[PDB]
Amino acid sequence: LHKEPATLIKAIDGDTDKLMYKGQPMTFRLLLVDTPEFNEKYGPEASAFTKKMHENAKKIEVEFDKGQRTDKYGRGLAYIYADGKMVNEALVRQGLAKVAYVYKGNNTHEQLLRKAEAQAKKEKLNIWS
Ligand SMILES: Cc1cn([C@H]2C[C@H](OP(=O)(O)O)[C@@H](COP(=O)(O)O)O2)c(=O)[nH]c1=O
Ligand SMILES: [Ca+2]
């Protein structure tokens, strides 16, 4: 897999953003994770966390997996990195997202995120509290 450039257009919520990619505005849905919706518990904390990670980033990058790059809603499916740090993993590691939506062929970083989830759970963090 490889990282490609993008620039923030807008934070949206825990697991979606709006980025400029190849010069076009797109909504991205983070691979392999599920944040609570804003109206749910930890939803606001998840949005804030993702927002901050995106907004404080000097450098945003997009990393597609091997499979479909867009979902049925037209959202890009990617791992997103803020200054080299994966947002998808960071959310899980903090217990602000669950590993979810693991579809065969876009699951390269499954075991990395599951390891983060086990640690967040051990620490009884947020969703696991
Ligand atoms: C993460 C992800 C979600 N989706 C779709 C499945 C779900 O369909 P449904 O909308 O029919 O439930 C939905 C969950 O996204 P959200 O968690 O953003 O709602 O997005 C994919 O198709 N591929 C993916 O890799
Ligand atoms: Ca969600």
The verdict on the CB of residue 13 being under 6 Å from ligand 1 is: no
* Experimental approach taken: X-ray
Measuring CA to CA, which residue among 56, 55, 47 is closest to residue 15?
Answer: 47
What is the rounded CA–CA span in Å between residue 64 and residue 109? 11
Q: Where are the domains of the chain?
A: 1-129
Running DSSP on this structure, what letter comes out for residue 15?
Answer: S
Would you say 34 is a known binding-site residue? yes
Q: Using a CB cutoff of 5 Å, list residues around ligand 2, an ion.
A: 34-35
Please give the structure tokens belonging to residue 58: 């000097």
What is the rounded CA–CA span in Å between residue 66 and residue 106? 6
Would you say 15 is a known binding-site residue? yes
Q: What is the resolution of this structure in A?
A: 1.8
Catalytic positions, written as ranges? 29, 37, 75
List b or e across 32-50, with b for residues whose CB sees 16 or more CB atoms inside 10 angstroms. Answer: bbbbbeeeeebbebbbebb
Class of domain 1-129: mainly beta
What is the rounded CA–CA span in Å between residue 115 and residue 119? 6
Point out the ligand 1 atom lying closest to the alpha carbon of residue 71.
22
Pairing of strands 33-34, 76-82: unpaired
What is the rounded CA–CA span in Å between residue 94 and residue 116? 8
